[PDB]
């Protein structure tokens, strides 16, 4: 049973400038993923919700520090690299892969992602899960987390 996950993904690009928040459709997937885990006993660290989906904006420095602490604390790292790419999320993949964290990465099926993203499959303790909608993710996530979590500590290139 999984104590803690860090859930990451695009943020800045999903904020509506007119409202200063993400739309319910974009919050959709995050909230769905949060519930799923929380209902099962698993603490979810997630910046989108912590920062009221754009309304309670941090300083770059605060935001940077919290994210790195939460990543380091969570048992498993789960994130959406984003199409187009989420700059802050890619920084976080660097952090997590650099700590040898169990990671699950959520990739839109039939979309292109970076070499240094896809190249972590095998190279680190990572599992890629391609998806055409949120329910697919919700169905497959627990298995993906258990498999990566069942390899924690184990040496890897990069780990
Ligand atoms: N205010 C923010 N707080 C944050 O914690 N972040 C972190 O950086 C990621 C989003 O990066 P972008 O905002 O660059 O897409 C999120 O997963 C979040 O963990 C990003 C922003 C906006 O750059």
Numbering used by the authors: 12 to 170
Task: Please give sentences taken from the publication describing this entry.
5-Hydroxymethylcytosine is then released via hydrolysis of the N-glycosidic bond of hmCMP by MilB.
The MilB-E103A/hmCMP complex also crystallizes with one molecule per asymmetric unit. The final model at 2.4 Å resolution contains residues 12–170 of MilB-E103A in complex with one hmCMP molecule. The hmCMP molecule is located in a deep surface pocket of MilB, surrounded by α-helices α1, α2, α3, α4 and α5. The benzene ring of Phe22 forms planar stacking interactions with the pyrimidine ring of hmCMP. In the electron density map of the MilB-E103A/hmCMP complex, the side chain of Arg23 can be placed in two alternative ways, suggesting that it varies between two different conformations, ‘intermediate’ and ‘closed’. On the other hand, in the ‘closed’ conformation, Arg23 is completely bended back toward the active site pocket of MilB, so as to recognize hmCMP. Its guanidinium group makes two hydrogen bonds with the hydroxymethyl group and the phosphate group of hmCMP, with distances of 2.73 and 2.37 Å, respectively.
